[PDB]
Amino acid sequence: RSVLKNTSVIDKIESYVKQYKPVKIDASKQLQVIESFEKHAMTNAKETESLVSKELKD
Amino acid sequence: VSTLIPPKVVSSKNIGSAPNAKRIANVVHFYKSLPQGPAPAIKANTRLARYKAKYFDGDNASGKPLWHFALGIIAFGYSMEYYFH
């Protein structure tokens, strides 16, 4: 800014930048899909685990 | 992207390979297996379970029963020779 001697636009774009400073807001969208996915996955994982462990001892 | 769900699903590896067939065979065969089989024959008793035991067991096949069996028929007709003569 101290480079520009025509400064009356650096204050403008500074204020515009600081205005739109939360340019994009927070996202956690993996919290409904991750838990649902975890349930189906967990169910299947434990089933497989128990099955093959059982077979090993058999 | 989000992984697929196959690696955590198993339910047809138990028909999926050949030793499954052998397994279901040898769980029955071996589980109810005896350490040793029952018998190599032993009946003919009347003081002749001994005859079978000495001669007609797996222990030996030798010409001794043959001689004995031959001699029985010889003893029949030899006595009968003097019944005919």
**Contact of B65 with B55, CB cutoff 8 Å:** yes
* A41 burial type by CB count under 10 A (0-12 exposed, 13-18 middle, 19+ buried): middle
Cβ within 8 Å of A, B 23-62: 27
Nearest chain B CA: its distance from A26 CA (Å): 20
The reported resolution of this PDB entry, expressed in Å, is 4.4
For residue A47, give every residue at least 6 positions away whose Cβ sits within 8 Å of its Cβ, in sequence order, or none: B9
Question: CB of B12 within 8 Å of any CB in chain A?
Answer: no
Backbone angles phi, psi at A54, to 5 degrees: -60, -45
Quote the CA–CA distance of A14 and A12 in Å, as a whole number: 5
Residue B29 burial (CB < 10 Å; 0-12/13-18/19+)? Answer: exposed
